[PDB]
Design a protein around this nucleic acid. Structure first.
Length: 55
DNA sequence: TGTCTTCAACTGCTTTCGCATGAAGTACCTCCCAACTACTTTTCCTCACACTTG
């Protein structure tokens, strides 16, 4: 019983992590470090003035 | 006259990447086709009757 229900959890976890990856990977892909060390999106809109606040 | 509230119907998604190996619909219709048997077809073959004879 335990071994099967383990194989079920093993076979379902990967479907709940693809949408977790892509759903915000679409959003932050534009998000990068400006040359001034500020985090701007590929739009240019500033997200953080420093990475984690320490660069 | 003006603004507000709930419910139900409607929208869009909910692992990735590849092998296999592609197959199969089907009603309505049929004209074509294959069949069994009989019937029909083209060339050829061979004999036969009457009037007259003597």
């Amino acid at each position: 019983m335990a071994g099967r229900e383990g194989l079920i959890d093993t076979a379902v976890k990967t479907s709940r992590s693809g949408y977790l990856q892509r759903c915000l990977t679409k959003q932050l892909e534009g998000v990068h470090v400006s040359y001034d060390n500020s985090i701007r999106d590929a739009d240019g809109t500033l997200v953080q003035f420093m990475y984690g606040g320490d660069a």
